Swiss-Prot record:
There is a cross-link at residue 26 (Glycyl lysine isopeptide (Lys-Gly) (interchain with G-Cter in SUMO2)). GO terms for cellular component: axon terminus; cell projection; cytoplasm; dendrite; endothelial microparticle; external side of plasma membrane; extracellular space; intercalated disc. The gene is Anxa5. SMART domains: ANX (SM00335). It comes from the Eukaryota. This protein is an anticoagulant protein that acts as an indirect inhibitor of the thromboplastin-specific complex, which is involved in the blood coagulation cascade. It comes from Rattus norvegicus (Rat). This is Annexin A5.
């Protein structure tokens, strides 16, 4: 059921494509249109081969060439599109941790919505690319229970999905009830362990049972019990447990919504998910926000940036 919007090009000719790209940048000016139309029509793996051919044919670096030709957000998008899939998330994480400050929004968004299998891969790529340990970096840049919850998640050791044990579902729902609503203060340690290590199928049942017992959806309790980064993280985990696509569709909505656009987030979610579940994200989006992702992007963005974006997204109605 998980569908992306970008797939492998049928009659792919890495060499032919490279020539088209050279021609589009050679001499005075840039044919941004041909670049944009070609790249959003190739899978990430094909973009990498195109980059290889371009280098053996011209002895020039494609990405470095595009960076000198392209400008602004269009450049940022195309550059993101050229990053190998297995390196992109690591790349975004590294840059969220970089600088004096730390972009918790990015850490929270990626660590909460990625599966353990994905976190495992992201950690390997991170280390072999930046020569640093992802966990060490996160710990060094975060504090309190927010940091603890991230580290628990980074262990990529969530319980596997097996037959649901009802007594166990009851036990956990009551535990969460006593750890929050019935407690003076909050036992965050309890929330972290349960929310961070139980299997996804188990927690979905726990969320429902928790509603029955308390009359509150777990999200309401989280909002009532916590605040700050921890709150954001816990809501992200809960939301992702329920549906990653729905969670990401929501992240997108709020990136555009307001005034102006959180282009970094808009670019990050579309590119990182283009070959995973961007189609599903499209569906959850229309259902929940009554708008088509396409129409939303088409109204908040402009220029080639907007054209490339819509081509990667697609489906005006879906
Ligand atoms: Ca030129
Ligand atoms: Ca530039
Ligand atoms: Ca309380
Ligand atoms: Ca709150
Ligand atoms: Ca806006």
């Amino acid at each position: 059921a998980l569908r992306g919007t970008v797939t492998d090009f049928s009659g792919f000719d890495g060499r032919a494509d490279a020539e088209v790209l050279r021609k589009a940048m050679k001499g005075l000016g840039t044919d941004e249109d041909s670049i944009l139309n070609l790249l959003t029509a190739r899978s990430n793996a094909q973009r990498q081969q195109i980059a290889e051919e371009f280098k053996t044919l011209f002895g020039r670096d494609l990405v470095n060439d595009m960076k000198s030709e392209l400008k602004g957000k269009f450049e940022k998008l195309i550059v993101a599109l050229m990053k190998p899939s297995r390196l992109y998330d690591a790349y975004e994480l590294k840059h969220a941790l970089k600088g004096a400050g730390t972009d918790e929004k990015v850490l929270t968004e990626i660590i909460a919505s990625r599966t353990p299998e994905e976190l495992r891969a992201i950690k390997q790529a991170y280390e072999e690319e930046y020569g640093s340990n992802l966990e060490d970096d996160v710990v060094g840049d975060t504090k309190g229970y927010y940091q603890r919850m991230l580290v628990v998640l980074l262990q990529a050791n969530r319980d596997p999905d097996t037959a649901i044990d009802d007594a166990q579902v009851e036990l956990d729902a009551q535990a969460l009830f006593q750890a929050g609503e019935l407690k003076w203060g909050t036992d965050e340690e309890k929330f972290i362990t349960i929310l961070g290590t139980r299997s996804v199928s188990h927690l979905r049942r726990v969320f429902d049972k928790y509603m029955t017992i308390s009359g509150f959806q777990i999200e309401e309790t989280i909002d009532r019990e916590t605040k700050g980064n921890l709150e954001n993280l816990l809501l992200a985990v809960v939301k992702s447990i329920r549906s990653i696509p729905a969670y990401l569709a929501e992240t997108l909505y709020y990136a555009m919504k307001g005034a102006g656009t959180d282009d970094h987030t808009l670019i990050r979610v579309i590119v990182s998910r283009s070959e995973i579940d961007l189609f599903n994200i499209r569906k959850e989006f229309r259902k929940n926000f009554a708008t088509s992702l396409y129409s939303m992007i088409k109204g908040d963005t402009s220029g080639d940036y907007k054209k490339a974006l819509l081509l990667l997204c697609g489906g005006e109605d879906d």
